[PDB]
Design a protein around this nucleic acid. Structure first.
Ligand code: CL
Ligand code: CL
Ligand code: MG
Ligand code: ZN
Ligand code: ZN
Ligand code: ZN
Length: 395
DNA sequence: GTCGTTCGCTACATGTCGTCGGTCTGC
DNA sequence: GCAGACCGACGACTGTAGCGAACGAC
């Protein structure tokens, strides 16, 4: 069976997240969005484990189900050097063992959903490998709390330890990450880092797995690519839409080149703020080869359907009009990805004509995109002639 | 034209832990 | 004067109450 899974979300116990991020709401929104699998997130926090055991029913010792949505145990932790890492746990026994194993290196493990571990990246990865916990650098290029902002290579961070994936992040896709030769041996994950269950947040990126059943072991085989199981697709936000795609200032969000950045010594002149290096420039720094492996699954860049609806209707992303149109699209059809990539534009025009024209413009790459940087998301705008012209003469 | 509804935007939170300036201090 | 301790503020890790103001079904 073919399932869409999002293995990186944060519960309401984490910081800077929404209080609505609870198991029932998450399951409802993932079901309405067409998301078959969602990682639990914050699994090290015992209160979130209690909420999971309450609001879910066991599929096996490591997979749970709530409101028809399956859930595997995932978590994100912060390094002694402020480097975020993602962990997938086989069973709840492994969750509890790893939790008790790191209580002597953390002070907020029972307090926050995203804990701070006073442990080296190598140490955390070794503790995960010993317990068969899958570990990988989460949002591995962001300039604030990533691996490649602190270290220059995966070996420099993990040393003799082993990692089982690399979360690409919003501002990256599989090709630019494959610009680093080591990554050719590593499976990619494209997750959402969801802090809100809203349309454009939960499942903004996901992984399309081929599995026999939706259980942790099947997902693990698919990530490793064994026994027929495989990650057959990597869907994600277009790299330009990300918060840190280009180098820009952290205060005024003015885009600077890498040359101008090193010239200004990372000081925004007309702002007085810290300018942070974009993930594109970082990858170009760490560039290794112009080649990339063939077994790599494709990466379908997508813009959130709610964002396209808000840009066509000329209204805010949270408005009731865009929410109503989004719900009508998700009722008439299956999922956001289907409406964005697979569905023919004539079928989209039955629900809304302007949205269909914008989706055609996004498919044909005739949609203006101002890239994001420094912490500001990229923006999508449509030309006038795309909206004022009919659909027949469009292509 | 009424007057509930919806919109867009600004301000603020909520704890740990870096970073990055400015300040004390002990020489 | 100066090295170096010390220190406070500031933002990532983003979401949303809540507040004038426009809207839009009577
Ligand atoms: Cl570095
Ligand atoms: Cl194996
Ligand atoms: Mg992406
Ligand atoms: Zn993170
Ligand atoms: Zn996260
Ligand atoms: Zn600036």
């Amino acid at each position: 069976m073919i399932v869409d899974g999002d293995l990186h979300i944060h519960s309401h116990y984490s910081k800077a997240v929404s209080k609505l991020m609870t198991f029932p709401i998450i399951a409802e929104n993932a079901k309405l969005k067409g998301l078959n699998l969602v990682g639990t997130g914050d699994s090290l926090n015992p209160h979130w484990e209690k909420e999971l055991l309450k609001h879910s029913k066991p599929i096996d010792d490591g997979t749970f189900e709530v409101n028809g949505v399956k859930f595997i145990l995932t978590c994100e932790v912060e390094d002694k050097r402020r480097v975020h890492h993602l962990l997938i746990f086989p069973t709840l026994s492994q969750v509890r063992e790893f939790r008790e194993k790191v209580k002597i290196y953390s002070t907020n493990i029972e307090s926050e959903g995203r804990p701070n571990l006073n442990l080296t990246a190598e140490e955390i990865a070794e503790m995960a490998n010993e317990l068969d916990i899958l570990i990988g650098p989460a949002h591995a290029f962001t300039p604030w709390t990533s691996l490649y902002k602190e270290y220059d290579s995966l070996k420099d961070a993990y040393g003799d330890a082993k990692i089982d994936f690399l979360e690409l992040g919003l501002s990256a896709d599989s090709d630019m990450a494959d610009m680093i030769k080591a990554h050719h041996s590593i499976p990619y994950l494209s997750n959402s880092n969801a802090h809100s269950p809203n349309p454009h947040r939960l499942g903004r990126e996901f992984n399309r797995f081929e599995v026999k059943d939706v259980t942790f072991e099947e997902i693990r085989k698919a990530i490793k690519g064994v026994g027929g199981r495989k990650i057959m697709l990597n869907a994600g936000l277009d790299p330009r839409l990300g918060k840190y795609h280009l180098t820009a200032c952290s205060r005024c969000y003015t885009k600077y080149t890498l040359q101008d950045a090193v010239s200004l010594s990372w000081k925004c002149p007309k702002c007085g703020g810290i300018i942070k290096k974009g993930v594109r420039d970082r990858i170009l720094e760490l560039a290794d080869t112009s080649e990339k492996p063939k077994d790599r699954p494709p990466y379908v860049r997508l813009a959130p359907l709610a964002e396209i609806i808000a840009m066509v209707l000329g209204k805010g992303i949270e408005s009731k009009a865009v929410k109503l149109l989004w719900n009508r699209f998700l009722r008439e059809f299956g999922s956001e990805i289907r409406v964005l990539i697979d569905l023919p534009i004539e079928s989209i025009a039955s629900v809304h004509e302007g949205v269909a024209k914008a989706i055609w413009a996004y498919r044909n790459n005739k949609l203006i995109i101002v890239p994001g940087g420094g912490g500001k998301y990229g923006e999508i705008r449509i030309p006038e002639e795309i909206l004022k012209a009919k659909i027949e003469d469009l292509n």
